[PDB]
């Protein structure tokens, strides 16, 4: 019958979000509540969310070696309890709303992320014991028969604290932990000198231990250059410890799970740990409410599969005009939306421009990240009239692109699942994607086209060489040409309808989570 599920993360859309993590922790818990399970999320109170009330509960926790208290705020929406951990170090980092969750600059992290996120894991464990759930806390607390779902490296110490602080005294004796991995590139690698700040005994030292040549940039809150080394140096790795201490490790697509366990490249050095522990993938779904052509509240014309020829053409012409491009619904249009970071291959699209004019297509690119990627992005229209770059976070334009574009272009170098392609398919927009991770799972040949592989930099941190960049360009264009060969044909029309008929909701994947959860507690 009824499961008790407590999701712990740094992000819960629409309150806090830097990407897909927030969308999953919004959508999956809502679907689980819909099925009838008791579900809550726990995350930091980064802003004074209007629908959240102070519960008046205070809980002592450690902020590094300092003893401190958190307060818990509580909101309730669509059958899900959202618990927010309140502390000066979460709220007062910036007056700006839903910005700078992980650091002040783009790639730069707060020095004190160790203390901040260790404190989150400690604070979350008390929630099932203390916070009354339901509409206005009428349902009482979740209790000890709880499954903690730890999302990504930020919460990966929770299983250690569960054992050390609770189960060692006979509390939560039957509670379970699930490590839900969204992205293996970030693992909570910290210097070993930060061990004392965790307030854990030495019995967990071996699980935390790690050797590598690739450290993140040093904890000085400005330096952006990662520390590569000729020698392999000793450090801590939170995600490793999380894998070794959880009851089960999951991730966000079967093919990504395969990649992680199959090689040091795919698992970013945690492949053997993932193999040892076992790692299963479940492809993300998505919510339909905000993203569907029938009810979309931003685009110029709503449509469904029957009226796609009318409404989508109008959206296309609207996108074209909005971007300063020649208005003509017969020119195939490619749209990119994503972080301007190595993972997503925005640098490949920009570098591909000289070769792209030959294809007789339009390209629209929307993203934020590196100052000089953003500067390059905005300059693209000058040299290339068929293309347009916009360096902003802009939901309205994202909606215009998803509806108006013929193709959704994702030249990712790695992609645990991806969300753009799911949205795109619901709008009848055809994905053209890199053959990596969950893009392989979500875009079979009936729905879209695969590129050749976009090659990674020879080592992390190292800016990709002009050599490998150009291989990516060629690899992307192979995929685009495959797609353009069918553009405008009866097969094109059919592929759009097949995309729109493709069910990408949380219904099926949520059911798979429930099966895994039921096995853990029985
Ligand atoms: C979009 C992405 O958001 C989250 O990733 C965070 C990192 O967790 C956080 O540490 C920070 O990363 C910086 C890092 O700390 C720093 O040392 C390094 O030099 O620069 C990094 C900045 O790029 O910020 C990022 C971005 O906000 C989540 O942890 C990720 O899971 C999430 N992406 C995932 C999520 C999903 C949803 O399931 C997948 O669909 C998607 O394929 C995958 O990319
Ligand atoms: N500049 C932007 N403006 C608006 N939305 C964006 C922008 N960049 C990314 N997004 C949205 O953020 C989400 C990113 O999710 P996903 O595709 O899983 O990539 P990530 O790896 O960043 O999580 C998508 O839903 C995408 O539509």
Numbering used by the authors: 0 to 521
The authors write:
Starch Synthases (SSs) transfer glucose from ADP-Glc donor to elongate pre-existing glucose chains via α-1,4-linkages. SSs are retaining glycosyltransferases classified within the GT5 family in the Carbohydrate Active Enzyme (CAZy) database. CLg1 (CLg1GBSS) and of GBSSI from the glaucophyte Cyanophora paradoxa (CpGBSSI). In all cases, they are in the closed conformation forming ternary complexes with ADP in the donor site and the inhibitor acarbose occupying the donor glucose and glucose acceptor sites that approximates the active site at the time of the reaction.
The crystal of CLg1GBSS contains three crystallographically independent protein molecules in the asymmetric unit of which one (chain A) is bound to ADP and acarbose, one (chain B) is bound to ADP and glucose from the cryoprotectant and the third chain appears to be a mixture of the two, although ADP and acarbose were modeled in the electron density. Two loops were disordered and not modeled in chain B, and its glucose is bound in a position equivalent to that of the last hexose, the amino-pyranose, of acarbose in chain A. The crystals of the catalytic domain of AtSSIV and of CpGBSSI both have two crystallographically independent SS molecules in their asymmetric units. The structure of CLg1GBSS has, in the same crystal, a protein chain (chain A) bound to ADP and acarbose and a protein chain bound to ADP and glucose (chain B). Changes in the conformation of the protein accompany acceptor binding: The loop between Ser15 and Gly18 adopts different conformations in both cases, with the largest movement corresponding to Thr17, whose hydroxyl group moves 7.1 Å to bind to the acarbose. The glucose in chain B supports this locus as that which is occupied by the glucose in ADP-Glc.
